[PDB]
CSV table of C-alpha atoms and ligand atoms in Angstrom, one decimal:
chain,number,residue,atom,x,y,z
A,1,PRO,CA,-32.8,-213.2,109.9
A,2,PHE,CA,-35.3,-215.8,111.3
A,3,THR,CA,-37.8,-212.9,110.9
A,4,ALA,CA,-36.5,-211.5,107.5
A,5,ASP,CA,-39.6,-210.6,105.4
A,6,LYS,CA,-40.0,-213.3,102.8
A,7,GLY,CA,-42.8,-211.4,100.9
A,8,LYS,CA,-45.8,-212.9,99.4
A,9,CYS,CA,-45.5,-216.7,99.0
A,10,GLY,CA,-47.6,-219.2,97.2
A,11,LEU,CA,-49.9,-216.9,95.2
A,12,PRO,CA,-52.1,-218.7,92.6
A,13,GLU,CA,-50.5,-219.4,89.2
A,14,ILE,CA,-52.1,-218.0,86.0
A,15,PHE,CA,-52.1,-219.7,82.6
A,16,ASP,CA,-52.8,-217.8,79.4
A,17,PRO,CA,-54.8,-219.9,77.2
A,18,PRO,CA,-53.0,-221.1,74.1
A,19,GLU,CA,-54.3,-218.6,71.5
A,20,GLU,CA,-53.7,-215.7,73.8
A,21,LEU,CA,-50.3,-217.1,74.7
A,22,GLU,CA,-49.4,-217.3,70.9
A,23,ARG,CA,-50.5,-213.7,70.4
A,24,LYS,CA,-48.5,-212.5,73.2
A,25,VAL,CA,-45.3,-214.3,72.3
A,26,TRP,CA,-45.7,-212.8,68.8
A,27,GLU,CA,-46.0,-209.4,70.3
A,28,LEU,CA,-42.8,-210.0,72.4
A,29,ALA,CA,-41.0,-210.9,69.1
A,30,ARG,CA,-42.2,-207.6,67.7
A,31,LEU,CA,-40.8,-205.7,70.6
A,32,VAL,CA,-37.5,-207.5,70.5
A,33,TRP,CA,-37.3,-206.7,66.7
A,34,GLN,CA,-38.0,-203.0,67.4
A,35,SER,CA,-35.8,-202.4,70.3
A,36,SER,CA,-32.3,-200.9,70.3
A,37,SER,CA,-31.2,-202.3,73.7
A,38,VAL,CA,-32.8,-205.3,75.3
A,39,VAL,CA,-32.1,-206.2,79.0
A,40,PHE,CA,-33.2,-209.5,80.5
A,41,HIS,CA,-33.9,-209.9,84.2
A,42,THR,CA,-34.0,-213.5,85.5
A,43,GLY,CA,-35.0,-215.2,88.8
A,44,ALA,CA,-35.5,-218.6,90.3
A,45,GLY,CA,-38.3,-219.5,88.0
A,46,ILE,CA,-36.0,-220.1,85.0
A,47,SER,CA,-34.4,-223.0,86.8
A,48,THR,CA,-37.4,-224.8,88.1
A,49,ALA,CA,-37.4,-226.9,84.8
A,50,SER,CA,-33.9,-228.2,85.8
A,51,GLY,CA,-35.0,-229.4,89.2
A,52,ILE,CA,-34.2,-226.5,91.3
A,53,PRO,CA,-37.1,-225.2,93.3
A,54,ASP,CA,-37.9,-221.5,93.4
A,55,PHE,CA,-38.5,-219.3,96.5
A,56,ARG,CA,-42.2,-218.1,96.3
A,57,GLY,CA,-43.8,-220.5,93.9
A,58,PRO,CA,-46.4,-223.0,95.1
A,59,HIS,CA,-43.6,-225.4,96.0
A,60,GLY,CA,-41.0,-222.8,96.6
A,61,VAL,CA,-38.5,-222.7,99.4
A,62,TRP,CA,-40.2,-220.0,101.5
A,63,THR,CA,-43.7,-221.2,100.5
A,64,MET,CA,-43.1,-224.7,101.8
A,65,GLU,CA,-41.4,-223.4,105.0
A,66,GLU,CA,-44.5,-221.3,105.7
A,67,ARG,CA,-46.5,-224.5,105.5
A,68,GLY,CA,-44.1,-226.5,107.6
A,69,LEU,CA,-42.9,-228.6,104.6
A,70,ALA,CA,-39.6,-229.0,102.8
A,71,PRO,CA,-38.6,-227.9,99.3
A,72,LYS,CA,-37.6,-230.7,97.0
A,73,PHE,CA,-34.5,-230.7,94.6
A,74,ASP,CA,-34.4,-233.1,91.7
A,75,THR,CA,-30.7,-232.3,91.2
A,76,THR,CA,-27.6,-231.1,92.8
A,77,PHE,CA,-26.3,-227.7,91.9
A,78,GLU,CA,-23.3,-229.5,90.4
A,79,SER,CA,-25.4,-231.9,88.2
A,80,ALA,CA,-28.0,-229.3,87.2
A,81,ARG,CA,-28.2,-228.5,83.5
A,82,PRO,CA,-29.1,-225.1,82.0
A,83,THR,CA,-32.7,-225.0,80.8
A,84,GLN,CA,-33.9,-224.2,77.2
A,85,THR,CA,-34.3,-220.7,78.7
A,86,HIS,CA,-30.8,-220.4,79.8
A,87,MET,CA,-29.5,-221.6,76.4
A,88,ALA,CA,-31.8,-219.2,74.6
A,89,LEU,CA,-30.3,-216.3,76.5
A,90,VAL,CA,-26.8,-217.5,75.4
A,91,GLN,CA,-27.8,-217.3,71.8
A,92,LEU,CA,-29.6,-214.0,72.0
A,93,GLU,CA,-26.5,-212.4,73.4
A,94,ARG,CA,-24.3,-214.1,70.7
A,95,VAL,CA,-26.4,-212.6,67.9
A,96,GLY,CA,-26.6,-209.2,69.6
A,97,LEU,CA,-30.3,-209.2,70.5
A,98,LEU,CA,-29.5,-209.0,74.4
A,99,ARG,CA,-27.4,-206.1,75.7
A,100,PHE,CA,-27.2,-207.2,79.3
A,101,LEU,CA,-28.4,-210.0,81.7
A,102,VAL,CA,-29.4,-209.2,85.4
A,103,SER,CA,-30.0,-212.2,87.5
A,104,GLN,CA,-31.0,-212.9,91.1
A,105,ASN,CA,-30.1,-216.5,90.9
A,106,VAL,CA,-27.2,-218.0,92.9
A,107,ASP,CA,-27.5,-221.3,91.2
A,108,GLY,CA,-24.4,-220.7,88.9
A,109,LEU,CA,-26.3,-221.7,85.7
A,110,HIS,CA,-25.9,-218.6,83.6
A,111,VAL,CA,-22.1,-218.9,84.1
A,112,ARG,CA,-22.1,-222.6,83.5
A,113,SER,CA,-24.2,-222.2,80.3
A,114,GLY,CA,-21.3,-220.2,78.8
A,115,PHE,CA,-23.0,-216.8,79.0
A,116,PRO,CA,-20.3,-214.1,79.1
A,117,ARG,CA,-19.6,-212.7,82.6
A,118,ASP,CA,-18.9,-209.2,81.3
A,119,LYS,CA,-22.6,-208.9,80.2
A,120,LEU,CA,-24.0,-210.6,83.4
A,121,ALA,CA,-24.8,-209.0,86.8
A,122,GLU,CA,-25.1,-211.7,89.5
A,123,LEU,CA,-26.9,-209.5,92.1
A,124,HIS,CA,-27.3,-212.1,95.0
A,125,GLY,CA,-23.9,-213.9,94.2
A,126,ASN,CA,-23.1,-217.3,92.8
A,127,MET,CA,-22.6,-220.4,94.8
A,128,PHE,CA,-19.7,-221.6,92.6
A,129,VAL,CA,-17.8,-218.3,92.9
A,130,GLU,CA,-15.4,-217.2,95.7
A,131,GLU,CA,-13.7,-213.9,96.0
A,132,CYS,CA,-10.3,-212.8,97.5
A,133,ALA,CA,-10.9,-210.3,100.3
A,134,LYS,CA,-7.6,-208.6,99.5
A,135,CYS,CA,-7.3,-208.3,95.7
A,136,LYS,CA,-11.0,-209.0,94.8
A,137,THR,CA,-10.1,-211.7,92.3
A,138,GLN,CA,-12.9,-214.2,91.7
A,139,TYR,CA,-12.5,-218.0,91.3
A,140,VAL,CA,-15.2,-219.8,89.4
A,141,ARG,CA,-15.2,-223.3,90.8
A,142,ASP,CA,-16.4,-226.5,89.5
A,143,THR,CA,-18.2,-227.4,92.8
A,144,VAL,CA,-20.2,-225.3,95.1
A,145,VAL,CA,-18.4,-223.2,97.6
A,146,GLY,CA,-19.4,-224.6,101.0
A,147,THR,CA,-20.3,-221.3,102.8
A,148,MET,CA,-22.9,-218.5,102.6
A,149,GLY,CA,-22.9,-214.9,103.9
A,150,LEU,CA,-19.5,-213.8,102.6
A,151,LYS,CA,-17.5,-216.0,105.0
A,152,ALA,CA,-14.0,-217.4,104.6
A,153,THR,CA,-14.1,-220.7,102.7
A,154,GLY,CA,-10.7,-221.8,104.0
A,155,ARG,CA,-8.8,-221.4,100.7
A,156,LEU,CA,-6.3,-218.7,99.7
A,157,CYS,CA,-5.6,-216.6,96.8
A,158,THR,CA,-3.0,-217.7,94.3
A,159,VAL,CA,-2.7,-214.5,92.2
A,160,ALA,CA,1.0,-213.8,91.2
A,161,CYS,CA,-1.4,-212.7,97.3
A,162,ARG,CA,-2.5,-215.4,99.8
A,163,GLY,CA,-5.7,-213.3,100.7
A,164,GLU,CA,-8.7,-215.1,102.4
A,165,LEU,CA,-11.2,-216.5,99.8
A,166,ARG,CA,-14.8,-215.8,100.7
A,167,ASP,CA,-18.2,-216.9,99.3
A,168,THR,CA,-20.3,-214.4,97.3
A,169,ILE,CA,-23.7,-215.5,98.7
A,170,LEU,CA,-25.3,-212.4,100.2
A,171,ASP,CA,-27.2,-212.8,103.5
A,172,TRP,CA,-30.3,-210.7,104.3
A,173,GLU,CA,-28.3,-207.7,105.8
A,174,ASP,CA,-25.6,-207.7,103.1
A,175,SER,CA,-25.7,-205.0,100.5
A,176,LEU,CA,-25.5,-205.9,96.8
A,177,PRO,CA,-22.2,-206.0,95.0
A,178,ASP,CA,-21.4,-202.5,93.8
A,179,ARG,CA,-20.1,-203.4,90.4
A,180,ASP,CA,-22.9,-205.7,89.4
A,181,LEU,CA,-25.6,-203.3,90.8
A,182,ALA,CA,-24.1,-200.3,89.1
A,183,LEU,CA,-23.8,-202.1,85.7
A,184,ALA,CA,-27.3,-203.6,86.1
A,185,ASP,CA,-28.7,-200.2,86.9
A,186,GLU,CA,-26.9,-198.5,83.9
A,187,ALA,CA,-28.1,-201.2,81.6
A,188,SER,CA,-31.7,-201.0,82.8
A,189,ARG,CA,-31.8,-197.2,82.6
A,190,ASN,CA,-30.5,-197.3,79.0
A,191,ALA,CA,-32.7,-200.1,77.9
A,192,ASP,CA,-35.7,-199.6,75.7
A,193,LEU,CA,-37.0,-203.1,76.5
A,194,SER,CA,-36.6,-205.0,79.8
A,195,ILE,CA,-38.0,-208.5,79.9
A,196,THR,CA,-38.4,-210.3,83.3
A,197,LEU,CA,-38.3,-214.0,83.3
A,198,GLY,CA,-39.3,-216.2,86.3
A,199,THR,CA,-39.1,-213.5,89.0
A,200,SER,CA,-41.9,-212.3,91.3
A,201,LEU,CA,-39.9,-208.9,91.6
A,202,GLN,CA,-40.4,-208.6,95.4
A,203,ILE,CA,-36.7,-207.9,96.4
A,204,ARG,CA,-35.3,-204.5,96.2
A,205,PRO,CA,-33.4,-203.1,94.6
A,206,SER,CA,-33.2,-206.1,92.3
A,207,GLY,CA,-37.0,-206.3,91.5
A,208,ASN,CA,-37.0,-202.6,90.8
A,209,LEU,CA,-34.5,-202.4,88.1
A,210,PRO,CA,-36.8,-203.4,85.3
A,211,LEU,CA,-38.9,-200.3,86.2
A,212,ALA,CA,-35.9,-198.1,85.4
A,213,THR,CA,-36.5,-199.0,81.8
A,214,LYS,CA,-40.0,-197.3,82.0
A,215,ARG,CA,-38.0,-194.0,82.4
A,216,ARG,CA,-37.5,-192.7,78.9
A,217,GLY,CA,-40.4,-194.4,77.5
A,218,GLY,CA,-39.0,-198.0,77.6
A,219,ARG,CA,-41.1,-201.0,77.4
A,220,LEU,CA,-41.4,-203.6,80.1
A,221,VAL,CA,-42.5,-207.2,79.6
A,222,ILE,CA,-43.1,-209.7,82.4
A,223,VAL,CA,-43.0,-213.4,81.9
A,224,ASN,CA,-44.2,-215.3,85.1
A,225,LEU,CA,-46.7,-218.0,86.2
A,226,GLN,CA,-47.7,-216.0,89.4
A,227,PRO,CA,-48.5,-212.3,89.8
A,228,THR,CA,-45.5,-210.1,90.3
A,229,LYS,CA,-45.0,-206.9,92.3
A,230,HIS,CA,-44.9,-204.7,89.2
A,231,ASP,CA,-47.6,-206.2,87.1
A,232,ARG,CA,-49.4,-202.9,86.8
A,233,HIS,CA,-46.4,-201.3,85.0
A,234,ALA,CA,-45.9,-204.0,82.4
A,235,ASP,CA,-46.7,-203.3,78.7
A,236,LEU,CA,-47.1,-207.0,78.3
A,237,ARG,CA,-47.5,-209.9,80.9
A,238,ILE,CA,-47.2,-213.4,79.7
A,239,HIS,CA,-48.5,-216.1,82.0
A,240,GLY,CA,-46.9,-219.3,80.9
A,241,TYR,CA,-43.9,-221.6,81.3
A,242,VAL,CA,-40.8,-219.6,80.5
A,243,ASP,CA,-39.3,-222.5,78.5
A,244,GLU,CA,-42.5,-222.6,76.3
A,245,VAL,CA,-42.4,-218.8,75.9
A,246,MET,CA,-38.7,-218.7,75.1
A,247,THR,CA,-38.8,-221.6,72.6
A,248,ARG,CA,-41.6,-220.0,70.8
A,249,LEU,CA,-39.9,-216.6,70.8
A,250,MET,CA,-36.6,-218.1,69.3
A,251,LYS,CA,-38.7,-219.8,66.6
A,252,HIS,CA,-40.3,-216.4,65.7
A,253,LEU,CA,-36.8,-214.9,65.7
A,254,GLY,CA,-35.5,-217.7,63.5
A,255,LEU,CA,-32.8,-218.6,66.0
A,256,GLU,CA,-31.8,-222.1,67.1
A,257,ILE,CA,-31.3,-222.8,70.8
A,258,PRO,CA,-27.7,-224.0,71.1
A,259,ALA,CA,-26.2,-227.1,72.5
A,260,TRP,CA,-24.7,-227.0,75.9
A,261,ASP,CA,-21.1,-228.3,75.9
A,262,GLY,CA,-21.2,-229.0,79.7
A,263,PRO,CA,-19.9,-226.5,82.3
A,264,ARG,CA,-17.8,-223.7,80.9
A,265,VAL,CA,-16.8,-220.3,81.9
A,266,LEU,CA,-16.7,-217.4,79.5
A,267,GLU,CA,-15.2,-214.2,80.9
A,268,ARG,CA,-15.6,-211.9,77.9
A,269,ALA,CA,-18.3,-211.8,75.3
A,270,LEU,CA,-17.2,-213.1,71.7
A,271,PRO,CA,-17.7,-211.2,68.6
A,272,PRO,CA,-21.4,-211.1,67.6
A,273,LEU,CA,-22.7,-213.7,65.2
A,274,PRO,CA,-24.8,-213.1,62.0
A,275,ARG,CA,-28.5,-213.0,62.7
A,276,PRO,CA,-31.7,-213.2,60.6
A,277,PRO,CA,-32.8,-210.0,59.0
A,278,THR,CA,-35.7,-208.2,60.6
A,279,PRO,CA,-39.4,-208.4,59.5
A,280,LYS,CA,-41.2,-205.4,58.3
A,281,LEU,CA,-43.3,-204.2,61.2
A,282,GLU,CA,-46.2,-202.1,59.7
B,301,AR6,N1,-41.2,-222.6,84.6
B,301,AR6,C1,-41.6,-221.4,85.0
B,301,AR6,N2,-42.0,-220.5,84.1
B,301,AR6,C2,-42.5,-219.3,84.4
B,301,AR6,N3,-42.5,-218.8,85.6
B,301,AR6,C3,-42.1,-219.7,86.6
B,301,AR6,C4,-41.6,-221.0,86.3
B,301,AR6,N4,-41.2,-221.5,87.5
B,301,AR6,C5,-41.5,-220.6,88.5
B,301,AR6,N5,-42.0,-219.5,87.9
B,301,AR6,C6,-42.3,-218.2,88.6
B,301,AR6,O1,-41.1,-217.7,89.0
B,301,AR6,C7,-41.2,-216.8,90.1
B,301,AR6,C8,-40.0,-216.8,91.0
B,301,AR6,O2,-40.2,-215.9,92.1
B,301,AR6,P1,-39.4,-216.1,93.5
B,301,AR6,O3,-39.6,-217.6,93.7
B,301,AR6,O4,-39.7,-214.9,94.3
B,301,AR6,O5,-37.8,-215.9,93.0
B,301,AR6,P2,-37.1,-214.5,92.8
B,301,AR6,O6,-35.9,-214.9,91.9
B,301,AR6,O7,-37.9,-213.3,92.2
B,301,AR6,O8,-36.5,-214.3,94.2
B,301,AR6,C9,-35.8,-213.1,94.5
B,301,AR6,C10,-34.7,-213.5,95.6
B,301,AR6,O9,-35.5,-213.7,96.8
B,301,AR6,C11,-35.1,-214.9,97.5
B,301,AR6,O10,-35.1,-214.6,98.9
B,301,AR6,C12,-33.7,-215.1,96.9
B,301,AR6,O11,-32.7,-214.2,97.4
B,301,AR6,C13,-33.8,-214.7,95.4
B,301,AR6,O12,-32.6,-214.3,94.7
B,301,AR6,C14,-42.5,-217.2,90.8
B,301,AR6,O13,-43.2,-216.0,90.9
B,301,AR6,C15,-43.1,-218.3,90.0
B,301,AR6,O14,-44.5,-218.3,89.7
B,302,7M2,C1,-31.5,-221.2,94.7
B,302,7M2,C2,-32.8,-221.8,94.4
B,302,7M2,N1,-33.3,-222.7,95.3
B,302,7M2,C3,-32.6,-222.8,96.5
B,302,7M2,C4,-31.4,-222.3,96.8
B,302,7M2,C5,-30.9,-222.5,98.2
B,302,7M2,N2,-30.2,-223.8,98.2
B,302,7M2,C6,-29.5,-224.2,99.4
B,302,7M2,C7,-29.5,-225.5,99.8
B,302,7M2,C8,-28.8,-225.9,101.0
B,302,7M2,C9,-28.2,-224.9,101.7
B,302,7M2,C10,-28.2,-223.5,101.3
B,302,7M2,C11,-28.9,-223.2,100.1
B,302,7M2,N3,-28.9,-221.9,99.6
B,302,7M2,C12,-28.2,-220.8,99.9
B,302,7M2,C13,-28.6,-219.7,99.2
B,302,7M2,C14,-29.7,-220.1,98.4
B,302,7M2,C15,-29.9,-221.5,98.6
B,302,7M2,C16,-30.9,-221.4,95.8
B,303,ZN,ZN1,-5.9,-212.1,96.1
C-alpha cells in the first residue's frame, strides 16, 4: 500500500520528427479505414492537456513522489474540460468507427464528454460515480465523490432501497469491476485494431488487454510520449502529443471534432451518424 509497486516512472519522452509523425498518422488512418472493429484504450496521458497530471510521466504523480516533489493540477476535477482527444473519441463512436472504449482513468472525463456509458469500460472507477452496495445502481454525480477504496460515502440509495452508497475508486488490493473487465476483454479479443492512447501499459490486467487483439491477427497501435510496456508488440508506435495525433487523424478521416456542451451523461449510445466514404486503399 505504501510499498505498492508503482512500476517504471519518469522514463525519457520520445518525439517523432514531423515528417515521420505525418507518415505514421497517415498509416493509422489507413488502419482505421481497413478495420472491422476498432477498440481504443486510454490512460492518464489523454488528460494532461486539460491540467490533470499523469502517474508516470516526467511530472507525473508517482514520478514526483519518487523525487520528493508534488504533482501539480492546473484544474479541479470539476472544472476540467475534455481534451480534443476526448471529443475526438465521442465523434468516432457516433460515426461507428469505434466499437468500444477501455479506460484506466478515474477523472470522469469520458463520461462528462457525453461518451456513451454502454460502450465504455471504466476499469479503475470514476471519481464522480458512486454505487449502491445493495442493488448495484450507479449515481453519476456532478461533483467528485469524497472517498476512495470502495468506502461508504454517507449517502443512501433512492431507487423505488436505502442501500449504502460507496465510491468506485479501486485501491491497490481491489479487483477490477467484473462487468467492465469482462466487456473490455470481449471487445479487445474481438477487435482487429486496438489503439492505445496516453497509457504506459504497466498495470495488469488493464495494460494487457490491447495484446488480446494480437490474437487472431489483430493490429496494435500505441500512441505515447514515453516507452510503454508492450512496445515490442505494436504494429505502429507513434511518439507525439495525443491531441496533435488525434486532430491529424480526424482531418484524414474527414471528421470534425465536436463541441462540448458542458458536463452531460449519456447512458446509451445514439444511432450512428453518416460518415465519409472510405478511400481506396491499394
Ligand atoms: N499529451 C500526451 N500525449 C501523449 N502521451 C502522453 C501525453 N501526456 C502524457 N503522456 C504519456 O501518457 C502515459 C501515461 O502513463 P501513466 O502515467 O502510467 O498512466 P496509466 O493510465 O497507464 O496508469 C495506469 C494506472 O496506474 C496508476 O497507478 C493509476 O491507477 C492508473 O489508472 C505516459 O507514459 C506519458 O508519457
Ligand atoms: C487521475 C490523475 N491524476 C491524479 C489522480 C489522483 N487525484 C487525487 C487527488 C487528491 C486525492 C486523491 C486523488 N486520487 C485518487 C485516485 C486517483 C487520484 C487521478
Ligand atoms: Zn440501491
